[model samples]
Target chain A: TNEVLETIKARRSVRAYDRKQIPADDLNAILEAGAYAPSGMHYETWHFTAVCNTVKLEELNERIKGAFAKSDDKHLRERGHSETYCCYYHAPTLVIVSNEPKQWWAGMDCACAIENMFLAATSLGIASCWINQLGTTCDDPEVRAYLTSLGVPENHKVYGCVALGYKAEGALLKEKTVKAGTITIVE
Target chain B: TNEVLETIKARRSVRAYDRKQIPADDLNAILEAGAYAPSGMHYETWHFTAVCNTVKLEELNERIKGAFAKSDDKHLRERGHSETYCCYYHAPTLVIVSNEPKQWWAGMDCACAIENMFLAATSLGIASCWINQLGTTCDDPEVRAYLTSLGVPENHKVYGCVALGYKAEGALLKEKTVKAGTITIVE
Candidate 1:
């Protein structure tokens, strides 16, 4: 009776991906799910930028890597992670969400959209990961120019990014334990 | 088949509400829906404090109104109408969301959860409004102390709040029109 609810509870962040591409129909459904996210003042001023081109993905990945390489943080350096790339475990498809820059609640609005996509993707048996590299590198001039060229309008900025594809073999879903300190209920 | 989508599109910010109280079951469902919203890193650090008690609601309202009245800005003064005590629309149920101060994305996370509640209320035929008075008054020491007494932890701040009840007769539903120049599409 709680199949959908169980799926939502059990859904975990998937970082590792197989080489297979997600079906276009499924991708469409996921994006559409995002479009259903609620917005403040009915300002549905969020955009979904789905990138499927391998060459462009690679170029973007390289730029992200370059940006990450410039960071002085030892943790990222040791992990060999860059600010421009997805921590998505090399998922074949990337969906980037951008929202109106000046909207008072744009970032939160985009997060809702991303959550919808994550749940919808899980329902479709596809793995999804919330990737923040692009959002982290979003302010870099090179990455910003590249995003603008890809049709990201000047009025908006990247809020969140995600990777969706098949999960790799032995790719365990992250544990779904709810941490205790952060939740409080008052009746 | 697309009734949910249509319902979502048709839902609007309902600022004015009737005197009727929301059904208890419907209120529970709305809160449950909010609890299910996705969180970054599955942090789940948000807290929801639902106030249905009239005495407490009035007290909170008075503090918020005081904050607005004390503000010297002409614009804020103009926006804070004389009848601002009904900022939460005198709704029988007022939910205040708070999150840990340490997280950079807590506001976004809580916003997502609030939007989910809005949609859930819409599906259940209840009208709701996103009320930001508490968040706006978050920095006021008196307001913060009162909230802490109401179970908002000392370490957390109000991210947003919502007012929920049946809609007043003839309450207008805002159209879901995406304003031009506000959103940019990135491919």
Candidate 2:
């Protein structure tokens, strides 16, 4: 229990990465963890598309930036900063999870899988971050076509994705300050 | 990696519970694990209303049943049974996670938190299942009022909850078969 709690507490999104290649074993392990996440009714229809090629990764980032910049919602529009902006934090690996949009619980189901990868990555001494802007990338026709080429199925939409690699500059994981009023423990 | 993978693989949605009380420390640890789940921009705005009270839990279940039975949606209507039905599987302890509805990534954010708690529960030998019926339950006026009575903030909606306890009546943890097509790796 302590180990698990420690793993949970220690896991944090690495905003910048040294971009060290995630070892094959580690990548496979993380993917395995994600695949094992629970699904309502156990339909298990989610799909994962992992990218490791640096060139392809950079291209995808450019598309993500374009998508965000064009979004009607301001948070995303601002996040859509052009040219120099890299949303994946230059992580060495990226994993995108997709599922049937019609699946009422797809977002939550995919979230569980993404989170399992986060914890699993941490346990393997990896640093990671949840990156949701990929869904916007999924909205763009060109990028959607690219994602399809990458093996995402038809009719599936991006639910969530993560950037995986090492923390930049030997960063340390800090204990998150507890927010007041977030938890109520019933006796 | 093996340990983490084992934990992930070991996790199962325990629908049938023996009603064994979860230890206070374990419960806190599970919730602690949940609180650590990453949120977009770190709003940390999620709320949890945990229930160990039999009366309140059963009442909530009854409300869910009533709401489901009367709903126009087919999925919910099918799940909505008579008063004797307990969707929670009669677990001894329950945890409900809520967040601001406008939080664009609420489903995913809340999902990560819920899954962390689920994994933490598994590590501690506590069986748990994610219960999304609360979303349906939230639509009912009396149910919503009851949620408000439980100290859930007005701006928040229940995103997910878990039924947690020990395995029931000489039960065994079953191995989950990995469904095909859930993963695709790129080189």
Candidate 3:
């Protein structure tokens, strides 16, 4: 009776990926679900930018890694300790969601849209991880210009992104250790 | 047919609410849906406080109105307008979502949960509106203390809130209009 409920509860942030391309119908379903996310004042300011090109994904990942590599911040530098790329374990497809820079609730609005996409992806047996690196560097002129060239409008800023593909072998069934402190319930 | 899709596309912010209480099962279903929203790093450090009492809702609404009235700035005053209570037209049931202050993504995570509840409410034939007045006053010590008294942890701050209820009679649907210059689509 609660299949949807179970799916929502069991969904996880999947960082590992297989190179297999996601089915087009499933991708459309995920995007459709994302577009359905509730917005502030019904503003509907959120945009979905899906990239299936491997070369572009690689280029974007390289740029993000370069930005982190150049940052003097210790936490940013520590990002290098992983596989040296910051696109959340190199999932084959990356979907970047952006919204107007001046909206009062742009970040919140876009975050909700991304969450809808993540849950939709999970329900379809696709794995996805939220990516924040692009959002952090989205304001950089160089990155902004590059993204604009890719058809992102000048008026919008990246709010969130997701790296998605098939889950890597043996990655699907592994449960993440649920850490405490993330939830509080008031009855 | 896609009833969920139809619901998503047609749902509007229902500001004027009827006095009838939301069924307890529907309320639980809505809150449960909110709890299952996706979070960054599985960091579910968000809390939902549901208040069904009319007296408390009115008191909180008046306090929020007072906070807005005190702001000398014209823009904020206009934002808070004297004639209307700022809980987006005063729905009977108010649900405040908050998260730990230390987490960078707490607001975004809370937003995801808020969207979930909103959509779920729509699916259940209930109307809801996103209310930002309470969150605007979240930083005030008085408001923070009240939230704490309502079981929000000391470490958490109000991120957002929603007013949920059945729509008042003859409440017309708002047209679906997306804001211009707010979205950027990249291929």
Candidate 4:
């Protein structure tokens, strides 16, 4: 498990992914890792929705991009207008997490679950990105109805999601952007 | 790295911890894992502050407790007044992450960083807990002063922290509580 070191530093978000499929074994392992992240104060009612189908992926992207186009925020609207934008970075699989409504620690709790999937993918030599596509738009009527049709529970709204797959050949990985001495140690 | 699967699933928040010290390499590895978490839109200004000194740890706990005691929130006040309550669960090392101030998705960025530390500790045979005590009370005068003394950047406040060390003999790990199909699949 201490091969652990490579996965920690080697993992990076892959915005361009080849269309190849993820093996079921590796997929399951990734989800298993995410499902067991620690919950706050013993509170646990987070919903996870993983998708691999091609048709729904297409529709989901449309709704996500459409929602973004309608946003008052210039950033969201501008992203929606990009000539080449796929909400999921064209990954083969995605696991969207929906945490409890108004849970005080829901944000961090969902995040803990997410990072596990990211690292698990890294260990398996796969690529993953934390996709926030549906995070703010999950409550939009069209998106909510689409998610409900996909069986995401009605009570929860999306906190975040992950894009999982192999990195495209010759695709660039963003260099880790951190300063020297980012860590301060006392004693 | 199927071992990665079991390691992730077995990770649990350990509340009661022994006073054993974490090894230097192990500690560094954990921090390395956190440093690699992706920042939103490449906004990578994140700082990780780690403390292991006994005196500093004690002072932190006292400040956290006092902050809770003064909070208007009933739950925090209740915990603060408890005779033997600790916000950090007596863990030997505390690593608090502070992201770039006012950065969009900073919460998620810091959260992702914190979870890497959590799982990294798990992979290394160390038990860890996600501590939220400093997050809400980061603005408290005393706590802010203490964090500043710790050299935390003035612009960034606490986002979340990881409490890490060996699980005490007979320390009770919290149960995992998710339904068989907390995840729904499309296709």
Clashing pairs in 4: none
The positional error of residue A29 in candidate 1, measured at the CA in angstroms, is 4.1
Q: Per-residue error at B175 for model 4, in Å?
A: 6.3
Evaluate residue B105 in candidate 1 and report its C-alpha lDDT on the 0 to 100 scale: 74
**Tens-digit lDDT track for model 3 on A1-187?**
1444445565677778888888877777777777767777677766787887787777666666666767788887666344665565768778888888676678888887787777677777889888888778876766776677776667888888877788899875565454444343333
Off by over 4 Å in 3: A1-7, A78-86, A173-187, B1-7, B73-88, B175-187
Q: In terms of docking quality, how is candidate 3 classified? A: acceptable
Q: What digit string (tens of lDDT, one per residue) describes model 2 on residues A44-88?
A: 889988888889888887777777778788877776775567878
lDDT by residue (tens digit), candidate 2, B1-187: 4666788889987878885688999998898888888898888889988888888888888778778889888866776766457878899988989888886788777898999999999999889999888875785887888788777777888889988999897787676878876778787
Model 2's A-chain: what TM-score? Answer: 0.91
Per-residue CA lDDT of candidate 4, range A53-151, in tens?
878887888888788888889988987777677888888888888887676668777887888888888888889988888878888888888998887
lDDT score for residue B131 of model 4: 85
Tell me how many clashing residue pairs each candidate has: 2, 0, 2, 0
DockQ of 3: 0.40
Q: Tens-digit lDDT track for model 1 on B1-187? A: 1434444455567877788888777777777767777676677778888887777887777777667778998766654546654668788888888888686678877876787677677777888878877766877887887798788877777888878888999987755554344333233
DockQ for model 1 equals 0.35
TM-score list, all predictions: 0.83, 0.94, 0.85, 0.92
Q: Indicate the DockQ of the complex predicted as candidate 2.
A: 0.77
TM-score between candidate 4 chain A and the true chain A: 0.92
Q: Fnat of each prediction? A: 0.31, 0.81, 0.36, 0.73
Best by TM-score: 2
Preferred candidate (TM-score higher): 2 or 4: 2
Using Cα atoms, each model's DockQ against the true complex is 0.35, 0.77, 0.40, 0.66
